[PDB]
Symmetry: C3
Amino acid sequence: PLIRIDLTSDRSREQRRAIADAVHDALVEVLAIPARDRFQILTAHDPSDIIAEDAGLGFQRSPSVVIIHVFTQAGRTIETKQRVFAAITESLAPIGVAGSDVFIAITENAPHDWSFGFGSAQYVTGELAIP
Amino acid sequence: PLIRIDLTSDRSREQRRAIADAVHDALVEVLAIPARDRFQILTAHDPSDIIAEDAGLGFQRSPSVVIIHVFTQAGRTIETKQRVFAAITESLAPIGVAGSDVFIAITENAPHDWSFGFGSAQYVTGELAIP
Amino acid sequence: PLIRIDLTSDRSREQRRAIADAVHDALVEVLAIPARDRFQILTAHDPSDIIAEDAGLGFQRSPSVVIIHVFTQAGRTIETKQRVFAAITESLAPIGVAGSDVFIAITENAPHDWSFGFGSAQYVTGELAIP
């Protein structure tokens, strides 16, 4: 999967990488993807450029929101997705991201929508196995 | 829905916020989503890093382009999507964004593809109602 | 299509622009979209903010990775996509992007999910021809 992580500049570079390592670890744990199946883009913003309210659920976030947008091939069940959300958030708590401050989205495509390099579609050529 | 707003750094922080407010008000109006269902990432770029032509439709833009990418759950009609486009653009006109300079894309997923916080899938658990 | 190109800040503005030209030419060649059907967002990051390993395929990348995310209408066949992946990658080699540092993903929607300006959905009204 390709993960876009958008967070705020008040967080140190060290914590940004901890955040990314945690998100990856969680995905490996729950999806059982190769440990080197890691593709992430981290973008830091001024806090005012991320606006994430509470959807009417009655809680408050700090300004240090972390938005995690997972682009991944279809196939995973609802329950597997619930576990993804849980593991990501649980992995982040001990490195300093509160549960209230994490927002996660999943967007799906097919195995034939990926190229990992060299102009090749490795799921189509079978150079990479499909989960 | 999760809205990525990509615009140009020459716009002031106030006009940036106004643009975000306008997109949000437009979606509330047309989609009848909760007022606090507001999730937005604004990213400012140097004007040269956004390239948006006309697809051969026969018009020109200024460099102050605003690209709006709406990630929302499936289920809205074609006609409703048109009302969204129209509303977003109309709302942005008085804020200093010309019709020529707006570009909007919609990418869909399902309700189970969302976590609004706390590592929970609120639509799946029933904590939030699915429109 | 809307193309998000994320790359690293070591690359010059000239090369960034040549990369964007290359990707667009490849897409015109393979997809046969109008020459001015060009919509791209180019974002430069600290090298440490883009992490792209090898999916366990047994190669190394330079830190100067280029991620290309194509958001486009559904309909293109598996082979057309394979052709896109290849055209893009070979277009970039001469301008200085090694085939090991290119990662491409495609995420699909429908013709009624686009507005090219003026609050109108041009594929739906007929003003723009469906590819």
